[PDB]
Amino acid sequence: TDTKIYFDASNLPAEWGTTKTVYCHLYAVAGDDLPETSWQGKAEKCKKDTATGLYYFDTAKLKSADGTNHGGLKDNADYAVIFSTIDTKSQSHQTCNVTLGKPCLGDTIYLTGGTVENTEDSSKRDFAATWKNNSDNYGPKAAITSLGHVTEGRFPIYLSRAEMVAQAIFNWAVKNPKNYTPETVADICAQVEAEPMDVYNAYAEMYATELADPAAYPDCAPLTTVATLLGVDPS
C-alpha cells in the first residue's frame, strides 16, 4: 500500500508561474505529535514522479523529535499540510492549510482555482486546494479564528465539534475579549454544530492542567468565564 501523498504542481493558477521545486509542510492536529520541520528545507522537499508528473511526499520518511523514524501516519490521528512551490523565477507560492489523514495516503492534492479565508487577516485569501478522491472528509482546514470567524473547509476527524470550539475559546477568548462575546460564541457553536454544554465539559477536560493556576496561563479563560460565554450553568 502507498505511503506517499501527491501534489499536482502542474495545473496551477496563473500566478504560480511554472513550478521549479515543491515542498510539503506537514504537522499534527490531533492524536499524534510531530516535530516542526523547516519551511522549504531539506526535510520538506518533494520529488517529481516521472511516470505521472506529480510531486510526492513520502509520509513513511517522517522522523520524530529524537530523530528516529516515526512509523508513518497513525490511525485515529488528524494532520494538516501546506504544499508550497518555488517557481522558475524563484517566487514562493503555497496552498491553504489542507487536512490530512491516513485515508488520504496515495491520493493527490490539486488547486481548485478557488480560495478560502485567511485565518490571520479576513481581508486576505489563501489558494484553495483539496484531495482528488478524499475531498468529502479532508480538505481546506476549517478553523475558528482569533476574531471568532468560522472559515470554510473540513473539520478534523478525531477531534469533536465541541472540543474545537473549546480550543478556540482557550486560544482567543482572553486576548480578543471583544470578539469572544456570548453571542459570537453562540454563533460559533451553531455554525460548527457544538452544543454549548458539550463545549463547556470539553473545555474543563482538555484544559484541566491549564485551569489549575491562572498565573501560569493568563490567556486561558477560567471556567466561570467559559460558562458565561457559552450561556451555560455548570450547576
Numbering used by the authors: 3 to 237
Tell me what the authors wrote about this structure, in their words.
Starch adherence system protein 20 (Sas20) is one of the more abundant proteins assembled within amylosomes, but little could be predicted about its molecular features based on amino acid sequence.
We solved the crystal structure of Sas20d1 via sulfur single-wavelength anomalous dispersion (SAD) phasing (2.1 Å, Rw = 17.7%, Rf = 21.4%) and then used this as a model to determine the structure with maltotriose (1.5 Å, Rw = 17.5%, Rf = 19.7%). The N-terminal β-sandwich most closely resembles a CBM26 module, which can be found adjacent to catalytic domains on α-amylases and typically binds maltoheptaose and β-cyclodextrin. A search on the DALI server showed that CBM26 from the Eubacterium rectale α-amylase Amy13K (ErCBM26) had the highest structural homology to Sas20d1 and aligns with an RMSD of ∼2.3 Å over 85 Cα atoms. While ErCBM26 and Sas20d1 share a conserved β-sandwich fold, two long loops formed by residues 146 to 161 (loop A) and 169 to 189 (loop B) protrude from Sas20d1 and are not found in ErCBM26. When comparing the native and maltotriose-bound Sas20d1 crystal structures, the CBM26-like fold at the N terminus is nearly identical. In the native structure, the α-helices at the C terminus of Sas20d1 are somewhat disordered with elevated B-factors compared with the rest of the structure, but in the maltotriose-bound structure, this region is well ordered. The Sas20d1 crystals with maltotriose (space group C2) have 45% solvent content and a tightly packed arrangement, with a crystal contact at the helical bundle. In each monomer, the helices (residues 237–257) are sandwiched between the same helical region (residues 237–257) and two β-strands (residues 58–70) of the neighboring monomer within the asymmetric unit and a loop (residues 93–104) of a symmetry-related monomer. In these crystals, there are no crystal contacts in the region surrounding the helical bundle, which in part explains the elevated B-factors.
